[PDB]
Design a binder for this molecule. Structure first.
Ligand SMILES: Cc1cc2nc3c(=O)[nH]c(=O)nc-3n(C[C@H](O)[C@H](O)[C@H](O)COP(=O)(O)OP(=O)(O)OC[C@H]3O[C@@H](n4cnc5c(N)ncnc54)[C@H](O)[C@@H]3O)c2cc1C
Length: 272
């Protein structure tokens, strides 16, 4: 390890203290936790995520999250989270376990963090190091275009990569994002994404689709499909890599079969 990082060993749990919280909307939040010292950084390679874990209702619960902060930040880590409230959706009366646990924490409370984890690492300037599985060394490749399909909270792994590319004036990679959600209200981090589109149009293409469309809507409506893939993601080729993160059903039934029909091979698609 070159820098003074927090995630020194992936097999260790680090209890971090909650020091700030922001109400983004009725069901969205930003939670900020302190690192071991004001001079520490998290130590999370681009492409990887951390896990939070705690005991809830007498059972151990573990869930993955990709922070919105970066290794440029000293002393804290920021998470943006959608809270799934109980007795709000007829199909899920109990709501979400970890997201409700976070919403119920008091400033000063701690929660376990672990990482970095994930089979893909972006090394910059279009280079991606990917492991076939946890027991293999990574194979490196270079691409010119990165396609991205996110559904709901799956936007954070994409935003982390987008920002790493754009922060580097000399990175020529172009990112194409197709962001899908249940309704316009559920579009997480829209202001942040549109600020990036206005400042870096040449290296970032943005498009949305929603299941429930508002009367005034300029984008697509419906599940991710063949037409959307052809019109808003780069064409198949060795110079293209497609990244995906979203609900299992969306990835399995809406993404994979249409990517196949369009010509994107599985050796050139990765799911976070
Ligand atoms: C690499 C990666 C990065 C991620 N990063 C983030 C992130 O930055 N921020 C983030 O918020 N999440 C993120 N997620 C996803 C998130 O890990 C988990 O699904 C999440 O917080 C769900 O936890 P839960 O324990 O709260 O819900 P659980 O208890 O797991 O699940 C309930 C399930 O039922 C449904 N459900 C329950 N209640 C409701 C309700 N009221 N309305 C609608 N549907 C409902 C949902 O489909 C949900 O997944 C990431 C996932 C991956 C794989």
């Amino acid at each position: 390890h070159h820098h003074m990082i927090t995630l020194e060993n992936p097999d260790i749990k680090y209890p971090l203290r909650l020091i700030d919280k922001e109400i983004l909307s009725h069901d969205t939040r930003r939670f900020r936790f302190a690192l071991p010292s004001p001079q520490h950084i998290l130590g999370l390679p681009i492409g990887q995520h951390i896990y939070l874990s705690t005991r809830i209702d007498g059972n151990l619960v573990i869930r993955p999250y990709t922070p919105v902060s970066s290794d440029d930040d000293k002393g804290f880590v920021d998470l943006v989270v959608k809270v799934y409230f109980k007795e709000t959706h007829p199909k899920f009366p109990a709501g979400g376990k970890m997201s409700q646990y976070l919403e119920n924490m008091n400033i000063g409370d701690t929660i376990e963090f672990r990482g970095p984890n994930g089979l893909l690492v972006y090394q910059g300037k279009g280079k991606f190091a990917i492991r076939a599985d946890k027991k293999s060394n990574p194979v490196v490749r270079t691409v010119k275009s990165v396609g991205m399909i996110a559904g709901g909270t799956g936007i954070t792994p994409m935003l982390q990569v987008i920002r790493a590319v754009l922060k580097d004036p000399n990175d020529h990679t172009v990112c194409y994002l197709l962001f899908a959600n249940q309704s316009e209200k559920d579009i997480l981090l829209r202001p942040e994404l549109e600020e990036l589109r206005n400042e870096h149009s040449s290296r970032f293409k943005l498009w949305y689709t929603v299941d429930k469309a508002p009367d005034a809507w300029d984008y697509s409506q419906g599940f991710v499909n063949e037409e959307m893939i052809r019109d808003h993601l780069p064409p198949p080729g060795e110079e293209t890599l497609i990244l995906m993160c979203g609900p299992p059903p969306m990835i399995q039934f809406a993404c994979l079969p249409n990517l196949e029909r369009v010509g994107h091979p599985k050796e050139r698609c990765f799911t976070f």
